[PDB]
Amino acid sequence: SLSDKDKAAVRALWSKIGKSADAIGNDALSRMIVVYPQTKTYFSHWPDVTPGSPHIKAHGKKVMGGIALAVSKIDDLKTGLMELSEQHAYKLRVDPANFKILNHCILVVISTMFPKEFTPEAHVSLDKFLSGVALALAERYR
Amino acid sequence: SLSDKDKAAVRALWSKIGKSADAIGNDALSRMIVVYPQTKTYFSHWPDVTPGSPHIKAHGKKVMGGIALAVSKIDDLKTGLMELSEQHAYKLRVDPANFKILNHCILVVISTMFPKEFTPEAHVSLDKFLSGVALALAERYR
Amino acid sequence: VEWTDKERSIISDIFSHMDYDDIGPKALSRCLIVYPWTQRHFSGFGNLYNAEAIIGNANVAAHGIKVLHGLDRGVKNMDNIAATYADLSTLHSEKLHVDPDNFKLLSDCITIVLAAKMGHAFTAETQGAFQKFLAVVVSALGKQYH
Amino acid sequence: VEWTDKERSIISDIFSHMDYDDIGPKALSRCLIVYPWTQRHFSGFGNLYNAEAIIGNANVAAHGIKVLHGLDRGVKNMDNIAATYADLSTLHSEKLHVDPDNFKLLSDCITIVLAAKMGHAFTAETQGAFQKFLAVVVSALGKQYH
Numbered sequence: 140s141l142s143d144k145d146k147a148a149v150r151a152l153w154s155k156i157g158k159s160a161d162a163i164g165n166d167a168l169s170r171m172i173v174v175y176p177q178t179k180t181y182f183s184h185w186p187d188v189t190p191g192s193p194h195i196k197a198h199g200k201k202v203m204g205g206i207a208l209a210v211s212k213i214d215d216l217k218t219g220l221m222e223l224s225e226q227h228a229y230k231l232r233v234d235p236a237n238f239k240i241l242n243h244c245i246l247v248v249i250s251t252m253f254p255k256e257f258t259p260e261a262h263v264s265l266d267k268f269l270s271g272v273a274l275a276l277a278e279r280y281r
Numbered sequence: 282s283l284s285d286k287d288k289a290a291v292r293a294l295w296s297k298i299g300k301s302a303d304a305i306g307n308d309a310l311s312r313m314i315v316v317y318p319q320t321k322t323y324f325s326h327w328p329d330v331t332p333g334s335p336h337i338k339a340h341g342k343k344v345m346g347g348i349a350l351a352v353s354k355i356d357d358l359k360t361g362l363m364e365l366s367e368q369h370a371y372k373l374r375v376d377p378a379n380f381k382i383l384n385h386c387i388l389v390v391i392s393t394m395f396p397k398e399f400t401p402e403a404h405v406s407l408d409k410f411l412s413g414v415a416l417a418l419a420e421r422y423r
Numbered sequence: 424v425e426w427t428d429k430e431r432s433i434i435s436d437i438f439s440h441m442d443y444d445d446i447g448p449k450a451l452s453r454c455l456i457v458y459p460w461t462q463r464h465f466s467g468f469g470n471l472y473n474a475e476a477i478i479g480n481a482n483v484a485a486h487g488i489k490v491l492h493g494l495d496r497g498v499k500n501m502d503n504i505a506a507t508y509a510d511l512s513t514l515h516s517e518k519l520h521v522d523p524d525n526f527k528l529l530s531d532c533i534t535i536v537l538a539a540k541m542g543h544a545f546t547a548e549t550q551g552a553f554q555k556f557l558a559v560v561v562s563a564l565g566k567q568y569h
Numbered sequence: 570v571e572w573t574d575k576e577r578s579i580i581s582d583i584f585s586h587m588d589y590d591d592i593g594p595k596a597l598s599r600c601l602i603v604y605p606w607t608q609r610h611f612s613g614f615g616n617l618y619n620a621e622a623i624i625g626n627a628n629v630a631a632h633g634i635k636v637l638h639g640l641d642r643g644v645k646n647m648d649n650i651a652a653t654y655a656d657l658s659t660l661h662s663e664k665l666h667v668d669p670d671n672f673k674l675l676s677d678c679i680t681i682v683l684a685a686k687m688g689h690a691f692t693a694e695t696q697g698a699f700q701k702f703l704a705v706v707v708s709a710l711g712k713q714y715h
């Protein structure tokens with residue numbers, strides 16, 4: 140549960156990070172499939188599912204579009220990501236555990252790229268934010 | 282995130298269960314210390330910390346008083362248990378993982394006692410409820 | 424730790440008075456209903472539409488019985504748990520790709536279903552021996568993938 | 570799995586170019602700050618009042634250096650990881666009573682701090698080898714209590 144300074148914090152960082160959202164998404168999604176290969180079955184219908192892959196690149200763009208969407212809806216993550224939750228938690232039946240994974244990979248990709256903006260303080264609020272995302276996305280399970 | 286039928290559900294069960302809240306608390310807290318002895322250090326200042334124990338019995342009464350409190354505040358767990366959160370998450374610095382534990386033990390004690398009221402359906406809503414409790418109690422960490 | 428005589432006794436006692444037919448169907452059903460993402464892996468099973476479709480699904484029942492029968496083999500082999508589950512491990516972690524957290528979810532359901540069948544006989548001490556048993560077997564279904 | 574030549578290479582390479590002095594203090598600090606319940610166990614350390622008190626606390630710094638130095642011993646012993654950590658295991662699980670989830674929290678912090686120091690050199694493949702290493706050592710700090 141995001142405080143006013145948590146929101147401010149997420150926003151100032153997204154403001155700096157944002158330019159590279161596509162690079163971040165592609166990079167984050169490739170690390171996920173490569174270091175936690177249990178996650179490759181959700182994308183098994185794609186031809187090429189390797190770090191290069193045009194498939195990986197397009198969808199990394201989409202995921203980060205979902206993070207931007209959530210920065211916008213940070214006052215109500217629950218109603219802001221209800222569509223995404225319907226699809227992930229209800230249609231795709233994505234194992235909740237994968238969200239901790241993808242989230243970790245995103246944090247690693249940001250350390251990679253913006254080592255200097257990614258302070259411990261920023262780290263705390265981005266983490267409460269990614270956890271709130273996950274909880275919001277978990278809405279349609281049960 | 283508790284639906285209207287989740288609240289109804291928790292309430293109809295607490296209505297049946299409630300009479301035995303003290304028995305439930307004592308029983309739940311003894312199972313916790315005995316099966317997950319990593320949790321005994323939080324109560325190390327008590328003389329006797331064994332299933333009999335008058336200490337265990339009094340505080341089981343208090344914990345279940347916190348569950349009753351939460352049934353009452355089920356529309357806003359977050360502000361309803363803010364005092365409890367201050368103490369657990371901020372003063373006691375209780376490891377978040379212990380809440381999954383205690384919660385599990387409570388569910389086991391209820392199966393023990395009200396096998397017939399503890400349906401799968403009741404099980405789902407009590408679980409979303411205990412998770413919401415835990416999240417509410419986690420409020421003052423970071 | 425490693426097995427105590429007391430634990431060996433309890434665990435063998437629980438498994439020898441257990442009704443596989445009753446407990447198995449119920450633990451799985453409940454797991455599928457309380458943690459519904461779990462159903463992703465039981466796709467071939469069919470009608471899983473809601474809680475009552477699951478409770479009466481025979482595919483689910485028969486498969487619940489087989490999880491129990493798989494527990495029974497580690498009961499018989501308490502000192503060689505990790506090699507007895509190797510095969511299982513491999514199927515669950517590399518053919519199937521089941522997050523290991525799920526094994527812990529199924530376990531909690533077996534305890535919960537056992538607690539209600541045993542009532543007050545399911546003591547703190549009996550709960551402790553049983554969770555040890557399941558801990559150790561959950562380590563073996565995962566063990567090799569990390 | 571068990572070690573590949575490729576992984577042995579990478580892991581030894583990461584540890585031989587690593588600055589313990591820089592990385593250790595930073596991984597621990599961050600862990601104490603992002604997952605603040607963790608501080609319960611570092612009580613004797615002192616002023617942990619807020620994020621800047623932690624970053625400059627010398628007790629924390631020196632102790633971060635020792636977690637790293639403890640990683641170094643498993644690096645030297647990749648085929649005998651579980652016996653090298655026995656002693657550590659015992660201290661963390663029965664003298665100290667640290668939930669095992671915490672070991673995974675500290676690890677993520679070491680990765681995060683390493684990713685920022687290595688930049689683009691910290692490849693998906695290098696991330697994979699390293700997480701394997703830490704997985705295996707997190708199993709050994711816990712291993713015996715279950």
Ligand code: HEM
Pocket residue numbers: 178181182201202203204205206223227231233237238241242272
């Ligand atoms: C962590 C935050 C996540 C966000 C913001 C997110 C966002 C998105 C978005 C925007 C789409 C859109 C495509 C559409 O509209 O059809 C999508 C699809 C998808 N997501 Fe995620 N997702 C997240 C996590 C996950 C995880 C962890 C997994 C799997 C382990 C996953 C599996 C999928 C799959 C399989 C699709 C469908 C793609 C396709 O059919 O080609 N998502 N997600």
Ligand code: HEM
Pocket residue numbers: 320323324343344345346347348365369373375379380383384414
């Ligand atoms: C799970 C839901 C829980 C509820 C509803 C709850 C409720 C309570 C309540 C009402 C008190 C009141 C005493 C006072 O007002 O000082 C309390 C105290 C306490 N709680 Fe909990 N608690 C929960 C979980 C936990 C867990 C999991 C632990 C430890 C593993 C824990 C450790 C403590 C301790 C150490 C105290 C202080 C008792 C004393 O100083 O004598 N609590 N809790």
Ligand code: HEM
Pocket residue numbers: 461464465489490491492493494511515519521525526527528529530564
């Ligand atoms: C929790 C401890 C568990 C035990 C002891 C266990 C045991 C077993 C056994 C004995 C089989 C049948 C093997 C055969 O006939 O060749 C099986 C199959 C299977 N298990 Fe588990 N299992 C466990 C947990 C899980 C969990 C948590 C999941 C979550 C999805 C799961 C998913 C599956 C699936 C999908 C199959 C194959 C079903 C089929 O293809 O017919 N298992 N398991």
Ligand code: HEM
Pocket residue numbers: 607610611635636637638639640657661665667671672673674675676710
């Ligand atoms: C994550 C992997 C970890 C490794 C490799 C590691 C390693 C070590 C080592 C090498 C020592 C010093 C041993 C000695 O000088 O006798 C130590 C002490 C300690 N560790 Fe860890 N540790 C880890 C995780 C954790 C975590 C997650 C916690 C959370 C609280 C923790 C809490 C402690 C404490 C309280 C001490 C003793 C501090 C003192 O009494 O001075 N450790 N650890």
